[PDB]
């Protein structure tokens, strides 16, 4: 334990130069791949808006093809999914984390076609659903594939360039280099035996698919809410209760996507004629509402410089945060293709403002704006729901920029992941993998 | 399989009593970093104080200058020989060994000699950093609260010694996520699992953060202001940026590793021999605390100055030269305080350097070198201690220029690679090795 | 830094009138800026406050319209219209910029100030 | 709103002398500020948050309390001290001053 030791300080950070020539290669395939799909799921979102200006006149008429646009898209969705590769489905990361543990597969040949075509299906009809779960799922499967392809050996290239894919999947999802990487670190590690993922691997993958990402789509941010104002002490302990608040609330949004989960399970009884049929039913009223309200469907990007800002009415958010738990749930619970993670960014942003705009009342003396309890509250609900804090930090300080922000920033988030835990609630992300293998020792 | 369904759902359980006892830990460890940096001014203040009543004859103002460093070296370097050897040189390798269990955390010793020793090598202006002295006595604190409270248990342990170092970094430079990065990234048992509880580490450094803004409100450790972005044709360069600092990453090893033992001889382990050659090295410190004070100090009074562009391309090339020698003599020869600090101010200069050359080369570039010097900032950092995630994290903390954050990863992983391709070593895992064998000899 | 009020001057009760504070030496957002009033030979008074994106908007407890504060940023000005003047009114007028060290709030720095006579 | 009334309206004091003004609220405060306001000039933030002294300030000022009274006060007066000092709460809205404390030249 002691002559072991110093034979293994020395031999530190070494990773074999082959490993990391084809983590290099995993990023550059990864992100040019989230860089398409999110070109995809645009420009079908773009046709969606073409056909509405088409017929513009006929009000019914018009509310008819923004549902079956959606429901055409969302139904061609679901049955990729449901004929070709029924693992991806829904997110995608807890079968990235099982992949990990060994106790799940990683079906390339298979996923890719159906994650990526999949999801530009029920994304580009304007579900509720982000781009992560495709991407980071996505992400996986291509540094399997140059694995499999290059048949490179070890338990080392096996997990690491499985890991570099999927961290670079969600640095190019979000522009966030370092939310990957730390997502990867903080989760997605087998958290109950030492693995050999070489983080300095994970890096270059990332790097490449980060530079991927800003070669097409430079010059604009994903989320611009510009320098807000900073946080002084006496200030501090009302976001503690802000995340106090999410702290109660992040389990009990866990358990209404895994009981909703099970009860739209029972209206298709696990038949695709049926479920894909729910599926359009879904999708199409995403499409619906992406017109009649536009802030409780989509993807939920659009709404949170306008909700930081303080645009929203009070009664206008209580109803947008309502409206927006439903569809959440509707597209996520109900198994489409498309991660949690975005809507559960927007879903924060708007408890933040809420709670924000009755702090500036209540304290007028604090000198209070709404903007700073709702970048706060961004990513606490990935902090008592997913129970990944430090990733959910870092992502909205990437992406929104507002360092100055951080004591807030990790106050409401651990404020959030100790209620959560005191709540008996669980990582969203590892209760899936759970309920999915549990479920395999139940069929066999 | 089923093993696994039973660890998934009791995942991020962590005792309530650990969690407590974590909080706790941070606000002492705060307090008394706090209380540490205050310290130190208070003792750089009189040392002004001095040459102030003797401004007039000049070679007695430089004697006073020498005297009053030599004689708070003196009492540094002597406070650690007597009571605490352990407690010597950075203290960073001592905590990571004791993460291992192959290393004690005598605290009933370390705090007093560490504590007190740091304010007299860092007070009479020495170059070297409070990391070392703060992540050292962070650790001691939390294993502290551990016997104090009798608290059972390998997580327990373990967890309490990590989130003090972490409050620890943190209370040393208000950067909150740079003292978790860097437990989770170095700190860790890197060849077995640890029970340290992530979210326990967090509470602490919250903590001790809100302690240090507390007390150090209004003022930045490094203000630097908005610099300019950085166009995609012009990553490359910072890839070649971070190779330079990739070659020299473990030259620069070798050499604070060999001067530790060229400088053994001077003293030959004697004490009495030892603090006088200590308070030779610090008197010469206080004494280039005047003469040129770019070279001595922690180096934080000129990375502003640097990344402006004020300095001549000569002055850096200088100003270099001097503080690789004078980071040295400080830290090598066992000086209490850490290494950390000194690599930053040695890697902004660096960086400054590559960047005025840059900009003549390619004006077309439309270059900056504060851009390159705040990539260049945390290399040295990701090249030596190799800990490059904690490294950019702990730039983007204090220098703010997050549009930079693609050239500063570049550049940093830039400097890893090359780090170890040329078969260096994390200088913090390098010397807890040297410590080791040292032992089993 | 300078705080540099004008607009001061005589008017006729039940009247009305426009202070101006222009500023100059740091970056005019970012700061709250305030109106204080002092009654002559009398203590300090507070007016009012406004938040850099002029989105919040305070006044001491006192009638309506009787004061309205706006800023242009784009010149660099805080404005404060009294109205329906009387005698009361009739003070010396700083305007304020605003900040903090704990969180409690104190009025930073001050203007020369203009001096409002109401009589007919 | 929350009452300030300062103890000695107008005083006097020697130079060099251990000159000490009150300031009492109506209510609970806490962190309150001081102001020096010399004749016919701009009022100069002087103590904030209880006891800070402002950059520039000489350090034979000083000032402390809490809750409901507190206290600025100076060890060695000098002439660069008599003007009116004028405390102010905002940890209540609306922010309020005191009525001020004239120090002046004892001769």
């Known amino acids: 334990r002691r002559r072991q030791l110093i034979r293994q300080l020395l031999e530190r950070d070494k990773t074999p130069l082959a490993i990391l020539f084809m983590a290099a290669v995993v990023g550059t395939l990864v992100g040019l791949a989230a860089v398409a799909f999110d070109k995809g799921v645009a420009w079908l979102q773009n046709q969606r808006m073409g056909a509405l200006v088409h017929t513009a006149d006929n009000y019914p008429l018009l509310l008819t093809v923004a549902f079956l646009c959606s429901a055409v898209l969302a139904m061609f969705g679901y049955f990729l999914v449901r004929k070709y590769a029924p693992e991806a489905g829904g997110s995608g990361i807890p079968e990235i984390e099982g992949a990990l543990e060994d106790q799940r597969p990683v079906r390339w040949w298979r996923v890719l076609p159906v994650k990526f075509f999949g999801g530009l299906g029920t994304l580009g009809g304007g579900m509720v659903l982000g781009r992560e779960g495709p991407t980071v799922q996505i992400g996986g499967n291509i540094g399997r594939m140059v694995l499999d392809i290059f048949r490179l050996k070890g338990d080392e290239a096996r997990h690491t360039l499985l890991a570099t894919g999927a961290a670079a999947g969600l640095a190019a999802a979000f522009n966030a280099p370092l939310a990957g990487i730390l997502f990867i670190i903080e989760q997605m590690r087998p958290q109950f035996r030492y693995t050999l993922i070489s983080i300095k691997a994970v890096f270059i993958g990332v790097i490449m698919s980060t530079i991927m990402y800003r070669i097409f789509n430079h010059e604009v941010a994903l989320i611009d809410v510009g320098k807000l104002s900073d946080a002084p002490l006496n200030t501090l302990w009302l976001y503690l209760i802000l995340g106090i608040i999410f702290g109660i609330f992040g389990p009990i949004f866990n358990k209404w996507v895994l009981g909703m989960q099970d009860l739209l399970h029972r209206v298709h009884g696990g038949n695709i004629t049926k479920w894909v049929l729910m599926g359009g039913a879904i999708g199409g009223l995403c499409g619906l509402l992406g017109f009649v309200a536009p802030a409780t469907s989509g993807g939920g990007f659009n709404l949170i410089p306008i909700a930081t800002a303080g645009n929203f009415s009070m009664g206008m958010l209580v109803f947008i945060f309502v409206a927006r738990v439903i569809t959440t749930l509707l597209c996520f619970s109900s198994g489409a293709p498309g991660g949690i993670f975005a809507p559960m960014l927007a879903l924060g942003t708007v408890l933040g403002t809420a709670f924000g705009m009755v702090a500036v009342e209540l304290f007028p003396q604090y000198h209070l704006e709404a903007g700073t309890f709702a970048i706060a509250g961004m990513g606490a609900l990935l902090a008592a729901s997913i129970r990944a804090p430090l990733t959910g930090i870092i992502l909205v300080l990437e992406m929104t920029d507002n360092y100055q922000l951080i004591l807030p920033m990790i106050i409401t988030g651990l404020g959030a992941t100790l209620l959560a835990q005191f709540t008996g609630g669980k990582p969203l992300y590892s209760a899936i993998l759970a309920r999915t293998l549990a479920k395999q020792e139940a069929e066999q | 399989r089923r093993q696994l369904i039973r660890q998934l759902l009791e995942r991020d359980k962590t005792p309530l009593a650990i969690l407590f006892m974590a909080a706790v830990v941070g606000t002492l460890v705060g307090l008394a970093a706090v209380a540490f940096d205050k310290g130190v001014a208070w003792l750089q203040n009189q040392r002004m104080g001095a040459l102030v009543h003797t401004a007039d004859n000049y070679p007695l103002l430089l004697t006073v200058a020498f005297l009053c460093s030599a004689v708070l070296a003196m009492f540094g370097y002597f406070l650690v020989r007597k009571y605490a050897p352990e407690a010597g040189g950075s203290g960073i390798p001592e905590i990571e060994g004791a993460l291992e269990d192959q290393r004690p955390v005598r605290w009933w010793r370390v705090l007093p000699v560490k504590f007190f020793g740091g304010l007299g090598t860092l007070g009479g202006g020495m170059v070297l950093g409070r990391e070392g002295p703060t992540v050292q006595i962070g650790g001691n604190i939390g294993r502290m609260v551990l016997d104090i409270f009798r608290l059972k248990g390998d997580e327990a342990r373990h967890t309490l010694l990590a989130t003090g170092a972490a409050a620890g970094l943190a209370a040393a430079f208000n950067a909150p996520l740079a003292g978790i990065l860097f437990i989770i990234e170095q700190m860790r048992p890197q060849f077995r699992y640890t029970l340290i509880s992530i979210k326990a580490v967090f509470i602490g450094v919250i903590m001790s953060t809100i302690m240090y803004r507390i007390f150090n409100h209004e003022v930045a450790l490094i203000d630097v202001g908005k610099l300019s972005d950085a166009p995609l044709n012009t990553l490359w360069l910072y890839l070649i940026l971070g190779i330079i600092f990739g070659i020299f990453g473990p030259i620069f090893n070798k050499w604070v590793l060999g001067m530790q033992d060229l400088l053994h001889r001077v003293h030959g382990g004697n004490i009495t021999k030892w603090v006088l050659m200590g308070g030779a090295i610090g008197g010469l410190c206080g004494l280039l605390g005047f003469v040129a004070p770019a070279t001595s100090g922690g180096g934080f009074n000129l990375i502003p100055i640097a990344t402006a562009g004020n300095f001549s391309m000569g002055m850096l090339v200088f100003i270099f030269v001097a503080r690789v020698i004078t980071t040295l003599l400080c830290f090598s020869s066992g000086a209490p305080g850490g290494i950390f600090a000194p690599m930053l101010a040695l890697g902004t200069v660096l960086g400054t350097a590559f960047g005025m050359v840059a900009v003549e080369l390619f004006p077309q570039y439309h270059l900056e070198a504060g851009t390159f010097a705040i990539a260049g900032m945390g290399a040295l950092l990701a090249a030596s201690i190799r800990a490059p995630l904690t490294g950019i994290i702990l730039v983007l903390e204090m220098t703010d220029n997050y549009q930079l954050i693609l050239p500063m990863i570049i550049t940093g992983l830039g400097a890893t690679l090359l780090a170890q391709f040329t078969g260096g070593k994390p200088l913090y895992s390098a010397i807890l090795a040297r410590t080791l064998a040292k032992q089993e000899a | 830094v300078r705080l540099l009020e004008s607009g001061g001057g005589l008017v006729q009760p039940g009247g009305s009138l426009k202070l101006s504070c222009a500023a100059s030496?740091?970056?005019?957002?970012?700061?709250?800026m305030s109106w204080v009033r002092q009654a002559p030979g009398k203590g300090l008074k507070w007016i009012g406050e406004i938040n850099p994106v002029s989105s919040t908007i305070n006044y001491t407890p006192s009638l309506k319209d009787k004061f309205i504060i706006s800023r242009d940023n784009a010149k660099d000005t805080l404005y404060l219209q009294i109205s329906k003047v009387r005698s009361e009114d009739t003070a010396l007028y700083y305007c304020?910029?605003?900040?903090?060290?704990?969180?409690?709030?104190?009025?930073?720095?001050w203007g020369a100030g203009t001096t409002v006579t109401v009589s007919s | 709103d929350i009452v300030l009334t300062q103890s000695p309206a107008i005083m006097s004091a020697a130079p060099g002398d251990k000159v000490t003004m009150t300031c009492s609220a109506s209510s609970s405060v806490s962190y309150i500020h001081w102001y020096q306001q010399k004749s016919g000039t701009s009022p100069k933030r002087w103590i904030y948050?209880?006891?800070k002294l402002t950059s520039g300030v000489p350090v034979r000022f000083s000032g402390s309390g809490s809750g409901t009274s507190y206290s600025l006060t100076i060890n060695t007066m000098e002439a660069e001290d008599a003007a009116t000092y004028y405390c102010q709460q905002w940890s209540s809205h609306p922010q309020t001053f005191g009525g001020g404390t004239k120090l002046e030249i004892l001769r």
């Open positions: 304020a910029r605003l900040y903090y060290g704990y969180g409690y709030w104190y009025f930073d720095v």
């Open positions: 030496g740091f970056d005019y957002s970012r700061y709250w």
């Open positions: 948050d209880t006891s």
